[PDB]
Design an enzyme around this catalytic site. Structure first.
Site, PDB file in Angstrom:
ATOM      1  N   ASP A   1      71.173  22.187   7.367  1.00 28.51           N
ATOM      2  CA  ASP A   1      71.309  21.552   8.691  1.00 28.51           C
ATOM      3  C   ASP A   1      72.748  21.676   9.231  1.00 28.51           C
ATOM      4  O   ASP A   1      73.502  20.704   9.258  1.00 28.51           O
ATOM      5  CB  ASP A   1      70.855  20.081   8.652  1.00 28.51           C
TER       6      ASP A   1
ATOM      7  N   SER B   1      74.040  12.153  15.038  1.00 27.15           N
ATOM      8  CA  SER B   1      73.665  13.459  14.477  1.00 27.15           C
ATOM      9  C   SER B   1      74.664  14.540  14.860  1.00 27.15           C
ATOM     10  O   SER B   1      75.065  14.627  16.021  1.00 27.15           O
ATOM     11  CB  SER B   1      72.295  13.906  15.012  1.00 27.15           C
ATOM     12  N   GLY B   2      75.055  15.355  13.887  1.00 28.72           N
ATOM     13  CA  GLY B   2      75.973  16.474  14.129  1.00 28.72           C
ATOM     14  C   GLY B   2      77.432  16.100  13.955  1.00 28.72           C
ATOM     15  O   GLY B   2      78.290  16.968  13.811  1.00 28.72           O
TER      16      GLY B   2
ATOM     17  N   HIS C   1      69.909  20.739  13.730  1.00 29.75           N
ATOM     18  CA  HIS C   1      68.873  19.990  14.460  1.00 29.75           C
ATOM     19  C   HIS C   1      69.343  19.513  15.848  1.00 29.75           C
ATOM     20  O   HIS C   1      68.526  19.051  16.642  1.00 29.75           O
ATOM     21  CB  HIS C   1      68.214  18.893  13.614  1.00 29.75           C
TER      22      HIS C   1
ATOM     23  N   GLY D   1      71.809   9.670  17.450  1.00 33.02           N
ATOM     24  CA  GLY D   1      72.915   9.779  18.386  1.00 33.02           C
ATOM     25  C   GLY D   1      74.224  10.133  17.697  1.00 33.02           C
ATOM     26  O   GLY D   1      75.110  10.688  18.346  1.00 33.02           O
TER      27      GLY D   1
HETATM   28  C1  LIG Z   1      65.756  14.721  13.933  1.00 36.74           C
HETATM   29  C2  LIG Z   1      66.076  13.481  13.106  1.00 36.74           C
HETATM   30  C3  LIG Z   1      65.687  13.694  11.642  1.00 36.74           C
HETATM   31  O1  LIG Z   1      67.474  13.204  13.198  1.00 36.74           O
HETATM   32  N1  LIG Z   1      68.005  12.243  12.389  1.00 36.74           N
HETATM   33  C4  LIG Z   1      69.035  11.598  12.737  1.00 36.74           C
HETATM   34  C5  LIG Z   1      69.525  10.597  11.777  1.00 36.74           C
HETATM   35  C6  LIG Z   1      70.892  10.466  11.585  1.00 36.74           C
HETATM   36  C7  LIG Z   1      71.369   9.542  10.660  1.00 36.74           C
HETATM   37  C8  LIG Z   1      70.470   8.760   9.927  1.00 36.74           C
HETATM   38  C9  LIG Z   1      71.013   7.784   8.926  1.00 36.74           C
HETATM   39  N2  LIG Z   1      72.180   7.984   8.486  1.00 36.74           N
HETATM   40  N3  LIG Z   1      70.289   6.738   8.512  1.00 36.74           N
HETATM   41  C10 LIG Z   1      69.090   8.904  10.101  1.00 36.74           C
HETATM   42  C11 LIG Z   1      68.611   9.835  11.039  1.00 36.74           C
HETATM   43  C12 LIG Z   1      65.356  12.273  13.660  1.00 36.74           C
HETATM   44  O2  LIG Z   1      65.823  11.638  14.732  1.00 36.74           O
HETATM   45  O3  LIG Z   1      64.363  11.832  13.119  1.00 36.74           O
END
Ligand SMILES: CC(C)(O/N=C/c1ccc(C(=N)N)cc1)C(=O)O
Ligand SMILES: [Ca+2]
Length: 223
Positions: free
Chosen positions: A84, A177-178, A40, A175
């Site tokens: 993912d 993510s990844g 993503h 932020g």
């Molecule tokens: C594209 C997507 C689903 O990306 N999500 C990132 C993310 C990362 C970590 C968490 C978490 N650990 N609570 C929650 C969300 C979005 O922004 O909606």
């Protein structure tokens, strides 16, 4: 990272920042030429930034290297976030040292209860927005699959696991993510998704890297 701590400069030497004019995702260096991130996080024109602590200040230990190719998992589903995971090839090999180092891929899947280290430059608030300059870290346990499925009924595949705290207050976030989830010195997860951040009964959901080792090894052997 919400409810975490300041890692300490270059204590997470496999942590990368993905930059497209600005930081937008994390990643993990798995050898001198390859980064694992979330599918993503895919976009064109990625620059990989290694050896970072403060992402807004060049502190002297950084290596900025353009991506030459990106390979999203062949079965990635952007709706369910199943599979993912993405590989990013660097245009030139990173110079490996104390501040820039690769993280091992797992040979076996991690266990429920195991403490993992999750890191990134993402939002530090569960409500509102605050983005740190320096790398943030969180120690969080892998949750049982049954508690993971209970938290997100109908959404958790065998390629996902939950980690964190059902009470809330401590989690990865947008932020991050990844980025890496490292357990017992192996890359076991990738920051993938979750309902908000650090919400009660809504732990982080992570790509289950141990399922992808064969695909990773085959892909890097041919690209
Ligand atoms: C594209 C997507 C689903 O990306 N999500 C990132 C993310 C990362 C970590 C968490 C978490 N650990 N609570 C929650 C969300 C979005 O922004 O909606
Ligand atoms: Ca820097």
């Amino acid at each position: 990272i919400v409810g975490g701590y300041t890692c300490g400069a270059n204590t997470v030497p496999y942590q990368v920042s993905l930059n497209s004019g600005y930081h937008f995702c994390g990643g993990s260096l798995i050898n001198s030429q390859w980064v694992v991130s979330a599918a993503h996080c895919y976009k064109s024109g990625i620059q990989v930034r290694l050896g970072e602590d403060n992402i807004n200040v060049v502190e002297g230990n950084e290596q900025f290297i353009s991506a030459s190719k990106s390979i999203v998992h062949p079965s990635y589903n952007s709706n369910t976030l199943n599979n993912d995971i993405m590989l990013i090839k660097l245009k030139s090999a990173a110079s490996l040292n104390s501040r820039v180092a690769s993280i091992s891929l797992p040979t076996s899947c991690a266990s429920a209860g195991t403490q993992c280290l999750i890191s990134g430059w993402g939002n530090t608030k569960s409500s509102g927005t605050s983005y740190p300059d320096v790398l943030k870290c969180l120690k969080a346990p892998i949750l049982s699959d049954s508690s993971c499925k209970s938290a997100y009924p109908g959404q958790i595949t065998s390629n996902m696991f939950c980690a964190g705290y059902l009470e809330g207050g401590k989690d990865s976030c947008q932020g991050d993510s990844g980025g890496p989830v490292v357990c017992s010195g192996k890359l076991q997860g990738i920051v993938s998704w979750g309902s908000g951040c650090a919400q009660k009964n809504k732990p982080g959901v992570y790509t289950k890297v141990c399922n992808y080792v064969s695909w990773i090894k085959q892909t890097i052997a041919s690209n």
